[PDB]
Short mmCIF file of C-alpha atoms in Angstrom, two decimals:
data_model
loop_
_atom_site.label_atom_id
_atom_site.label_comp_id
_atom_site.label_asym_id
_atom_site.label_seq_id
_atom_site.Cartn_x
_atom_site.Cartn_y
_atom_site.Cartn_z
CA UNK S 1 -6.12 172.89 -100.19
CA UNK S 2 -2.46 171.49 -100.01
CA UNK S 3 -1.75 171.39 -96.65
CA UNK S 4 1.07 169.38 -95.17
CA UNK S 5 0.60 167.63 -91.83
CA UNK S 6 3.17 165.91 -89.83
CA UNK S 7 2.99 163.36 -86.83
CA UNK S 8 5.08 163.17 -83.75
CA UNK S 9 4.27 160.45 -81.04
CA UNK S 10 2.15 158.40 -83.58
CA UNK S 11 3.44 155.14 -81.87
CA UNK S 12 3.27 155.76 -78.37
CA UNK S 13 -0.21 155.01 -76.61
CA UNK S 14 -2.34 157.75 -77.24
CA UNK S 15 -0.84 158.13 -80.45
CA UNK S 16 -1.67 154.74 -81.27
CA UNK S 17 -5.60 155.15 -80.60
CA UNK S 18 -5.46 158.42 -81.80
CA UNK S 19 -4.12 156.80 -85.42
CA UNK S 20 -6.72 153.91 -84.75
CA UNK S 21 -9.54 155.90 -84.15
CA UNK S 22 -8.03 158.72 -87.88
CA UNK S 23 -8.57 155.08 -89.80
CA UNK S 24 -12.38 154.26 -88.28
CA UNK S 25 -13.25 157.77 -89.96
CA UNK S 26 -11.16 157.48 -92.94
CA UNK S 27 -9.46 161.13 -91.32
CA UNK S 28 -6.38 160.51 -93.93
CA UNK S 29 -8.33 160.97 -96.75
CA UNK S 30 -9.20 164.38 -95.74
CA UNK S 31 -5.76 165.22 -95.13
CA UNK S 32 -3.86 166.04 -98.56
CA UNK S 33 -0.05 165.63 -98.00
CA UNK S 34 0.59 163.60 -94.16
CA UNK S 35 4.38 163.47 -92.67
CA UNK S 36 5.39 161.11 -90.08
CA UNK S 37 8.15 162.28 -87.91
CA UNK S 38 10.36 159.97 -85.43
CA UNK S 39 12.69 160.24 -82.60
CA UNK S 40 14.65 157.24 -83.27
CA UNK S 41 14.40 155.98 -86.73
CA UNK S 42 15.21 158.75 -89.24
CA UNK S 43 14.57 157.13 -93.16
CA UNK S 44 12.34 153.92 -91.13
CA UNK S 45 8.82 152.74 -92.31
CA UNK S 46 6.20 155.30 -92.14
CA UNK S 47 2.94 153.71 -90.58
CA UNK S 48 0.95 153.60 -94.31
CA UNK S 49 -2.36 155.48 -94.48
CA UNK S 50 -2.10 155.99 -97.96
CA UNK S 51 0.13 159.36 -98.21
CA UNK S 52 3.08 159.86 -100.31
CA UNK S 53 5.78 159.83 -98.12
CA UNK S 54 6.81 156.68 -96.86
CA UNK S 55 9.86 157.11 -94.52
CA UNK S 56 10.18 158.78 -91.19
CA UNK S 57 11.17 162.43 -90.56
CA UNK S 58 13.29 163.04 -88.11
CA UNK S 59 11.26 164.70 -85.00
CA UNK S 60 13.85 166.42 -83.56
CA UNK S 61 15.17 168.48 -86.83
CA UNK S 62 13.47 172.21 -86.36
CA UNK S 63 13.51 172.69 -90.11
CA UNK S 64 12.02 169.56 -91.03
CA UNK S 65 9.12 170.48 -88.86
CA UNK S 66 8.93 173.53 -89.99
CA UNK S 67 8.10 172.29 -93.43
CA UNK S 68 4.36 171.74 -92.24
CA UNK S 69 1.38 173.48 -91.97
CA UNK S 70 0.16 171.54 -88.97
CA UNK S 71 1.55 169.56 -86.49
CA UNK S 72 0.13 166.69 -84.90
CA UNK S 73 1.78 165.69 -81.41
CA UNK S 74 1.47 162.94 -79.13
CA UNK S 75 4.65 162.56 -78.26
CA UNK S 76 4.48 164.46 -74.99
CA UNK S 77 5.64 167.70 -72.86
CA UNK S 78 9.19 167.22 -72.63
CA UNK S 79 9.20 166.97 -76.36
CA UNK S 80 6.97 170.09 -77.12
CA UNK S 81 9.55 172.24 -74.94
CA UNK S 82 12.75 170.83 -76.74
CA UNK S 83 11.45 172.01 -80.02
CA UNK S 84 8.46 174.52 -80.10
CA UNK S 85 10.11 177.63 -79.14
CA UNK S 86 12.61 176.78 -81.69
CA UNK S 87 10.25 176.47 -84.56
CA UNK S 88 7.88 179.32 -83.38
CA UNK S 89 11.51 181.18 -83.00
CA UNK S 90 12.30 180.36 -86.77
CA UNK S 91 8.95 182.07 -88.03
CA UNK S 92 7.11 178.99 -88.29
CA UNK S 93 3.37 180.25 -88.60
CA UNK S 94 1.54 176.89 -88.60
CA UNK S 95 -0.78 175.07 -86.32
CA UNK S 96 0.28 172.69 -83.36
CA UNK S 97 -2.10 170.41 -82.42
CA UNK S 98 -0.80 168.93 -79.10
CA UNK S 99 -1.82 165.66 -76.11
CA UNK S 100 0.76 167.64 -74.12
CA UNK S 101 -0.14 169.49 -71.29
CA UNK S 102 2.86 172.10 -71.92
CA UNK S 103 0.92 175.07 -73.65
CA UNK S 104 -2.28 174.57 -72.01
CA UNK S 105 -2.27 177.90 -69.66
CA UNK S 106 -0.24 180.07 -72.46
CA UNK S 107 -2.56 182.99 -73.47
CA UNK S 108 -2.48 182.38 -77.53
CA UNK S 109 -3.43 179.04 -77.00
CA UNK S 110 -6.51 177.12 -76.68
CA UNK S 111 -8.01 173.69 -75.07
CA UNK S 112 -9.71 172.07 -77.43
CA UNK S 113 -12.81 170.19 -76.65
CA UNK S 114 -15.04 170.77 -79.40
CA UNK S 115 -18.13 169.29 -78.23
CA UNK S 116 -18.04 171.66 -75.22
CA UNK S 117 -16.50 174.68 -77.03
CA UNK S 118 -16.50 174.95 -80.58
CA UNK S 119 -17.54 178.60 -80.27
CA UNK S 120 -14.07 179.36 -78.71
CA UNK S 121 -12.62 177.01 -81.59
CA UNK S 122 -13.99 178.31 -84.32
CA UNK S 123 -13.20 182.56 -83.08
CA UNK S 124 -9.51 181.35 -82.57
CA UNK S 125 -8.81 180.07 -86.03
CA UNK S 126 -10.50 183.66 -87.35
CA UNK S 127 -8.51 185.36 -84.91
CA UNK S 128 -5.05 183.60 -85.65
CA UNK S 129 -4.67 181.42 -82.72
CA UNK S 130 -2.08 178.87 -83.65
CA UNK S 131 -2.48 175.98 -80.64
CA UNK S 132 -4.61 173.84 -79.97
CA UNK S 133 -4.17 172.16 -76.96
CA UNK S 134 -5.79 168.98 -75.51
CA UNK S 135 -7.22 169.15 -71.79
CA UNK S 136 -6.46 167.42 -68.67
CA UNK S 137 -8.18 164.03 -68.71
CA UNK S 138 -10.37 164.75 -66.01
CA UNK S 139 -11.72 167.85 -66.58
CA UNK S 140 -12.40 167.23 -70.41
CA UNK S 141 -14.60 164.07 -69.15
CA UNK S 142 -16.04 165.90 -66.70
CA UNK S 143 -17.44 168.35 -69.60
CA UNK S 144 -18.30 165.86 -71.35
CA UNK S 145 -20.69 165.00 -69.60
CA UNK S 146 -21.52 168.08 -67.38
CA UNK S 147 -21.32 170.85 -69.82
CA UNK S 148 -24.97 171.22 -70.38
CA UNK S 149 -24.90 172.86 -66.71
CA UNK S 150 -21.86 174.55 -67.36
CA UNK S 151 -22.32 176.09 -70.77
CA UNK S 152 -25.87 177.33 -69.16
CA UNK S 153 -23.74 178.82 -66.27
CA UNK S 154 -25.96 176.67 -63.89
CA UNK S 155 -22.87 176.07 -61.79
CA UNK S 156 -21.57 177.83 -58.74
CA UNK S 157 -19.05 174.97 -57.72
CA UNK S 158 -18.33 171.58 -58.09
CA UNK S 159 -15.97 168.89 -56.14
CA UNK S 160 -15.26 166.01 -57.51
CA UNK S 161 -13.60 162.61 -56.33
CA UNK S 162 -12.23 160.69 -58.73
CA UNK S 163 -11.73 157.33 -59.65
CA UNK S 164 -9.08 157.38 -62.19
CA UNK S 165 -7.40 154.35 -64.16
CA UNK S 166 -4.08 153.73 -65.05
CA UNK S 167 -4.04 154.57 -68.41
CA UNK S 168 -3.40 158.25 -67.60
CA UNK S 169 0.36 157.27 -66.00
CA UNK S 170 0.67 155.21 -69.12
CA UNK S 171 1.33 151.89 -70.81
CA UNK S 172 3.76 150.55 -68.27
CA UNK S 173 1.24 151.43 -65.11
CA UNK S 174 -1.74 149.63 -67.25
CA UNK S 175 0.64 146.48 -67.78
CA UNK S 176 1.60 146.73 -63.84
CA UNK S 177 -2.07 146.83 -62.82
CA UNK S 178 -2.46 143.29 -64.84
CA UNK S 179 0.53 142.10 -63.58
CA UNK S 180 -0.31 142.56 -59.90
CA UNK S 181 -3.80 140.91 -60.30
CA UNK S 182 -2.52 137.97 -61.58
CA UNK S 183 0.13 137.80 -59.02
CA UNK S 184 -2.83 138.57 -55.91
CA UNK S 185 -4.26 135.76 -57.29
CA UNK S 186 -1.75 133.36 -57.43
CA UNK S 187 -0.97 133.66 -54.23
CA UNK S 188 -4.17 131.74 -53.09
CA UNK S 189 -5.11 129.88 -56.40
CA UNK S 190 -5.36 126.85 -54.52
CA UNK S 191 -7.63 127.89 -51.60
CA UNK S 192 -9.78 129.53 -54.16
CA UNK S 193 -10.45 126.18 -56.06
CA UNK S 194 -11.14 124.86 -52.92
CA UNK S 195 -14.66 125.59 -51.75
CA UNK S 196 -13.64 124.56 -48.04
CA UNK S 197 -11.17 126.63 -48.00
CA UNK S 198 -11.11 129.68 -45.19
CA UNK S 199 -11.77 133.17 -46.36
CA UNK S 200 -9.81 134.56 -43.02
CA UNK S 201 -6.63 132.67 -44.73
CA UNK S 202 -7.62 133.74 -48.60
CA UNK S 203 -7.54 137.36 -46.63
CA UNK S 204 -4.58 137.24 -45.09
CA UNK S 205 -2.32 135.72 -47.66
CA UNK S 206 -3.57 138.72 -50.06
CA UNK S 207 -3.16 141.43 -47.35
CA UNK S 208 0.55 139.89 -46.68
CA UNK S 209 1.06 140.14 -50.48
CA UNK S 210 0.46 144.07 -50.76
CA UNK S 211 2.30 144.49 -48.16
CA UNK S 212 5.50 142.27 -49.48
CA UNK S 213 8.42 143.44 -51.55
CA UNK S 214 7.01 140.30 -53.77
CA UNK S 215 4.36 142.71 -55.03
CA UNK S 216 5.13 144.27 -58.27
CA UNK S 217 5.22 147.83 -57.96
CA UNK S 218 8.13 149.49 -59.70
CA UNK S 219 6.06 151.97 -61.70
CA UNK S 220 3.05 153.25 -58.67
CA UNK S 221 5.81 152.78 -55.99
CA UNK S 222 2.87 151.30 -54.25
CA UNK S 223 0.14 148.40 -54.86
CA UNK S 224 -2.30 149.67 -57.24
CA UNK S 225 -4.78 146.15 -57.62
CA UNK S 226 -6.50 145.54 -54.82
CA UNK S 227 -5.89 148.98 -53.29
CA UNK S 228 -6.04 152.85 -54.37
CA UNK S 229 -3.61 155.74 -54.73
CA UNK S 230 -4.78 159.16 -53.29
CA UNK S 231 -2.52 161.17 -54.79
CA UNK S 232 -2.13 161.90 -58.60
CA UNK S 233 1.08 163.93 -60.26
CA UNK S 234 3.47 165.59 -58.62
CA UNK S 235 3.00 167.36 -55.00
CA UNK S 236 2.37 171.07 -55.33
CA UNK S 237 3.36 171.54 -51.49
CA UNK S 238 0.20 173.10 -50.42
CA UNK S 239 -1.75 169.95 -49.87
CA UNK S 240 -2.76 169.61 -53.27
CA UNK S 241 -2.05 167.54 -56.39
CA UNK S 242 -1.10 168.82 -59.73
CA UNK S 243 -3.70 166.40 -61.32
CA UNK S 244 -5.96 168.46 -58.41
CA UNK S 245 -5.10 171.71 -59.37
CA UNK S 246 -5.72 171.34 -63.07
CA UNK S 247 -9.44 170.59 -62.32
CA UNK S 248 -10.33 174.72 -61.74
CA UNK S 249 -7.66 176.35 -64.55
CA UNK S 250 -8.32 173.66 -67.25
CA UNK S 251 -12.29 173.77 -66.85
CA UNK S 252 -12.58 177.46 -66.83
CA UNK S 253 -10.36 178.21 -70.37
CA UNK S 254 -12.26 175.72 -71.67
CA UNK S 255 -15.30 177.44 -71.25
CA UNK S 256 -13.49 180.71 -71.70
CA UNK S 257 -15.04 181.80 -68.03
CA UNK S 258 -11.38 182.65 -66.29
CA UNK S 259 -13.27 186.31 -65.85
CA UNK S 260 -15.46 185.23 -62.91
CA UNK S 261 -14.20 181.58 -62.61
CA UNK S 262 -16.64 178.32 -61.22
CA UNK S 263 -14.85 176.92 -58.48
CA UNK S 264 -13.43 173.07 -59.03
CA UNK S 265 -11.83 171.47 -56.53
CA UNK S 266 -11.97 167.92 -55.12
CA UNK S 267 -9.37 165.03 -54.67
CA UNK S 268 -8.00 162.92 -57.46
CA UNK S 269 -7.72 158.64 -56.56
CA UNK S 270 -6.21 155.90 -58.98
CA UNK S 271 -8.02 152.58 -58.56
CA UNK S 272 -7.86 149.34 -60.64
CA UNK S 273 -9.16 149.95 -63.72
CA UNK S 274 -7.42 150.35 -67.15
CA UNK S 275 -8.48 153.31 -68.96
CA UNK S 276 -11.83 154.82 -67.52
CA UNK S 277 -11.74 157.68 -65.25
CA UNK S 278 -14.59 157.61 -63.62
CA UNK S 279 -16.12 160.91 -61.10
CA UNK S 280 -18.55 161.15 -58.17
CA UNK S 281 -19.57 164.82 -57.91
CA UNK S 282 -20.92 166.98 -55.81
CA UNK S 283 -22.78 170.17 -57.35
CA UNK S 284 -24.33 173.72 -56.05
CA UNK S 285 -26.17 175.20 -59.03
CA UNK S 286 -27.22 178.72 -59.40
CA UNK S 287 -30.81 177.38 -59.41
CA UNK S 288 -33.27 174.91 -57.57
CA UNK S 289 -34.49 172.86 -60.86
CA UNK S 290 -36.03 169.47 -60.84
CA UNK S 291 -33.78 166.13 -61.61
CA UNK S 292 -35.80 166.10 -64.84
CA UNK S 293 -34.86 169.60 -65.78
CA UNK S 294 -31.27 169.28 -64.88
CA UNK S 295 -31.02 165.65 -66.89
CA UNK S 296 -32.69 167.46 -69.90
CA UNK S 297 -29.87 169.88 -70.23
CA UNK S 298 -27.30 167.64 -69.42
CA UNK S 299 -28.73 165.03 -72.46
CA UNK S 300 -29.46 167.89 -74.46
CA UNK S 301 -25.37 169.37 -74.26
CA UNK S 302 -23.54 166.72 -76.91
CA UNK S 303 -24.32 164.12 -79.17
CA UNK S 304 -21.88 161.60 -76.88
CA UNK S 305 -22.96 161.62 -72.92
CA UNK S 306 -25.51 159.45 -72.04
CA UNK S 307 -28.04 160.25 -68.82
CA UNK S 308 -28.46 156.89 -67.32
CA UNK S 309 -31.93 157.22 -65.03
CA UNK S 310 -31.32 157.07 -61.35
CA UNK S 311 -32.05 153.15 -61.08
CA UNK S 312 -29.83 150.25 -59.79
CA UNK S 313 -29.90 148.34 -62.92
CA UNK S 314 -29.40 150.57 -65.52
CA UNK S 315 -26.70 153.05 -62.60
CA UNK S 316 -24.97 149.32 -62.55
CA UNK S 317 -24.94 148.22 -66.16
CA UNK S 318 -24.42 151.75 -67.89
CA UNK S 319 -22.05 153.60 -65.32
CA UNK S 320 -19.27 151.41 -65.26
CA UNK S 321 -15.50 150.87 -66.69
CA UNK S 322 -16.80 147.55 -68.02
CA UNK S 323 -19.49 149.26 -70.03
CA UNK S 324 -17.20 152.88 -71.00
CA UNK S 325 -13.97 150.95 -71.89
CA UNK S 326 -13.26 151.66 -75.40
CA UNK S 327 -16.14 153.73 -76.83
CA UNK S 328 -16.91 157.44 -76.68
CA UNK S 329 -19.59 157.61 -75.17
CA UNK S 330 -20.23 159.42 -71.59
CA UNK S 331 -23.00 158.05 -69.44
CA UNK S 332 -23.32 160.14 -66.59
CA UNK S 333 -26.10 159.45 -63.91
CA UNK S 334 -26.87 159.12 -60.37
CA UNK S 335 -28.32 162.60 -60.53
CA UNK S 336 -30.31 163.27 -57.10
CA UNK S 337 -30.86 166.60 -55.04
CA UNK S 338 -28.90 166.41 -52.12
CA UNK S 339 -30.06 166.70 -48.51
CA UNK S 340 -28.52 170.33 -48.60
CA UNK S 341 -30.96 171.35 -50.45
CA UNK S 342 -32.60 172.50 -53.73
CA UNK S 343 -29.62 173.86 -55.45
CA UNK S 344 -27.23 170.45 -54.48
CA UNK S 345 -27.06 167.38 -57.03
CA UNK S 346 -24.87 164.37 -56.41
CA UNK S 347 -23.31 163.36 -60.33
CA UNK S 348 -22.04 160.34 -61.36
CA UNK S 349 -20.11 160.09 -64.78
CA UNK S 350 -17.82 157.58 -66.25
CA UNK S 351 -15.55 157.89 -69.49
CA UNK S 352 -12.75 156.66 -71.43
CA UNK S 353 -9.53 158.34 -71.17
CA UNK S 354 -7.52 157.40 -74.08
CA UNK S 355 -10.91 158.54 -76.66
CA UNK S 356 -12.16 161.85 -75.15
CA UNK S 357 -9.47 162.20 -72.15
CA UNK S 358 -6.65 162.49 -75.04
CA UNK S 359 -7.04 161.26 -79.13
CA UNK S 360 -10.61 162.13 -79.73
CA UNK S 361 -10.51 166.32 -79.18
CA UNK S 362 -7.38 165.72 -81.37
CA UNK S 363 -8.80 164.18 -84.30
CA UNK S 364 -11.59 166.21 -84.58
CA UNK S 365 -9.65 169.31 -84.22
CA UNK S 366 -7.27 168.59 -86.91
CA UNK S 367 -10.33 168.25 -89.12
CA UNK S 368 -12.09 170.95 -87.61
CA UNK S 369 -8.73 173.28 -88.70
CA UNK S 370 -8.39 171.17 -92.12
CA UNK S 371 -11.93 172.14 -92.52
CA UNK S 372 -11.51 175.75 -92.09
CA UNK S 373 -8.52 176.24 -95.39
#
């Protein structure tokens, strides 16, 4: 009933939505005694949600960390290897709730998604499990809004191609993407206010510009607006991407089904957009079950995916970045059996990555663990 929480990361991006979305829900008032720790400002301005202690900890000092019952990171992987063997090292028996993909695979930790897997949440924290990790953007979306078929073990595999937004490389890569629309555009500003004006020349001064050291680049290496990346993270070697390979590990700890694993493979694409990931799926289920059926269990899985019917106007207005961006819920649609047959669906989902791709599991975590002392 006294428990001491500290924050790491609380001003980078994730950790600013994650402290964004801890005010919408009034989270600090559930949380007795909150520490925020920095990297760079020792004795600074604490952000002020009402707690006691005002100035900065510093982030990097093993035995000031140590001094709390949780920690809450989203200050990243590099920093969760400088200093959690070192505090686990020292004794230090609390819980670490981490963005970080760092601890994700480690045997006495867990993925939190709590929607999804609560069950495997709540038997950790009676069995002593100390880490709570947050999943891979992707896959945590795709559960979202898949896990009805999942948690019924209705799947046998899965690919899915992504569409993934910048977000997930970070703030820089988002500011880029603006940057380099504004800059397509200005090369032909004037031929675009002039209805007369040839599209074959609009086309080609564009197509010059992605192809010009004019372009700004410096954080994709390559044009991201008006174009696409195939290749996500850093190149395993064996034709795959990390972001790739994460899709079959991440999904089956989640579910706690690494005994006799579902197969999830696919390739992972960055597009234009800011912070939506968005996934076009293909599906073999265990069983040959009508569309209704199969949308029934998907609607029926969480309180925040949304089945959009399989209609142009709603698949348009509901299944989009423009719609997602910002809010927690997880439409998921375009659900049709596939000319393969019974068993094959075609899945469509959408979803922000900042909310459930990152702060939201983490929020709702720390209360779930608050709740549970």
């Amino acid at each position: 009933h006294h428990m001491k929480v500290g924050f790491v990361g609380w001003r980078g991006m994730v950790g600013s939505v994650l402290m964004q979305r801890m005010k919408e829900e009034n989270d600090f008032a559930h949380i007795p005694e909150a520490f925020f720790f920095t990297s760079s400002n020792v004795g600074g301005a604490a952000p002020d949600f009402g707690q006691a202690a005002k100035t900065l900890l510093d982030a990097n000092d093993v035995a000031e960390l140590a001094k709390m019952d949780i920690i809450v990171t989203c200050q990243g992987g590099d920093y969760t290897k400088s200093v959690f063997q070192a505090l686990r090292d020292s004794g230090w028996n609390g819980y670490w709730i981490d963005a970080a993909s760092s601890l994700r695979m480690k045997d006495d930790a867990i993925i939190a998604l709590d929607p999804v897997n609560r069950n495997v949440i709540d038997n950790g924290l009676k069995n002593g499990v100390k880490n709570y990790i947050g999943g891979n953007c992707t896959v945590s979306l795709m559960l979202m809004a898949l896990g009805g078929l999942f948690q019924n073990d209705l799947v046998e595999w899965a690919t899915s191609m992504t569409y993934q937004a910048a977000s997930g490389a970070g703030a820089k890569n988002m500011r880029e993407l603006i940057s380099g629309m504004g800059a397509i555009h200005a090369q032909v500003a004037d031929e675009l206010a002039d209805p007369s004006s040839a599209i074959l020349d609009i086309d080609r001064k564009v197509s010059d510009f992605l192809r010009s050291e004019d372009y700004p680049k410096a954080n994709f290496g390559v044009p991201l607006a008006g174009s696409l990346i195939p290749w996500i993270d850093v190149d395993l070697g064996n034709g795959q991407s990390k972001e790739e390979w994460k899709g079959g590990v991440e999904t089956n700890k989640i579910l706690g089904r690494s005994g006799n694993p579902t197969v999830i493979d696919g390739l992972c694409v960055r597009i234009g957009a800011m912070r939506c990931h968005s996934q076009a799926i293909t599906l073999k289920l265990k069983k040959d079950l009508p569309v209704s059926e199969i949308e029934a269990i998907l609607a029926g899985a969480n309180d925040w995916v949304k089945v959009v019917p399989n209609e142009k106007e709603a698949g348009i207005r509901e299944l989009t970045p423009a719609k997602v961006t910002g809010t927690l819920s997880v439409p998921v649609g375009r659900i049709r059996k596939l000319g393969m047959g019974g068993e094959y669906i075609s899945a469509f989902t959408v979803g922000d990555q900042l909310l459930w791709g990152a702060a939201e599991p983490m929020r709702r975590v720390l209360r779930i663990v608050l709740g549970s002392l």
